[PDB]
Design a protein around this ligand. Sequence first.
Ligand SMILES: [Ca+2]
Ligand SMILES: [Ca+2]
Length: 73
Amino acid sequence: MKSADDVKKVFHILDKDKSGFIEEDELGSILKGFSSDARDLSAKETKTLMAAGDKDGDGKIGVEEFSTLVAES
Ligand SMILES: [Ca+2]
Ligand SMILES: [Ca+2]
């Protein structure tokens, strides 16, 4: 389990425009937020991930939804 501070650090790295949410144009870099040597997601993978992760349906991923995505299974 990653700490809340660690999770927020990655969220901030992904939120390039500081909007407070990860929009579609920022989500493809998600694996890179954790390890710079990770691959980019394809456009199709990004759209799929956005749909799966956007639990409240507002079209973007906020901090709680992002935390849920990375919660330890
Ligand atoms: Ca953003
Ligand atoms: Ca959302």
